[PDB]
């Protein structure tokens, strides 16, 4: 029963489908915005990282996935290296790949 005149944002339906998203670091990395990539990542997440070790490991896994995704392209690889270095981890797995 849609009593209220609904639209592209019916309040009950809007709750039924409220699915928001933030500009995840993939935006900068995939573009290739290194220093801004790390900095915005920290701005959003470093404080938000209630589990700094766990969150750091997860971000590293994401970084490795992203890097592996783009073997041929040069720019993506360079961005991957820089983001790994700014992360604080090893810089040989991605380079070896």
């Amino acid at each position: 029963a849609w009593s209220h005149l609904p639209h592209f944002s019916s309040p009950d339906l809007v709750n039924k489908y409220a699915i928001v998203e933030r500009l995840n670091f993939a935006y900068y990395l995939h573009n290739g915005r290194p220093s801004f990539a790390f900095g915005t990542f920290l701005v959003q997440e470093l404080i938000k990282s209630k589990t700094p070790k766990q969150l750091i490991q997860q971000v590293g896994n994401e970084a490795y996935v992203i890097g592996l995704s783009s073997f041929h392209i040069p720019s993506i690889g360079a961005a991957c290296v820089c983001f790994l270095e700014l992360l604080g981890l090893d810089s040989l797995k991605l380079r070896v790949d």
Partner: protein
């Protein structure tokens, strides 16, 4: 250091061990030294068995101390 030894994406995708301050030139010097040695090595070592050893044992001790192979 790369430029001086020669004397971005160019580099950050090469495969030296780590991008630390020293390791780059350290490895460059090590590899160059090993090559410059082994080249002269094979050069010297490319140069009767018992007879040859006997003759090589008949020289003066200071001369033998400067055996290029031993050197």
């Amino acid at each position: 250091y790369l430029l001086m030894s020669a004397s971005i994406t160019e580099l950050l995708q090469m495969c030296w061990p780590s991008l630390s301050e020293d390791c780059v030139a350290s490895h460059t010097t090590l590899s160059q030294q090993l090559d410059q040695v082994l080249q002269s090595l094979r050069e010297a070592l490319e140069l009767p068995p018992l007879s040859s050893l006997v003759e090589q044992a008949a020289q003066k001790a200071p001369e033998a101390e400067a055996h290029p192979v031993q050197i």
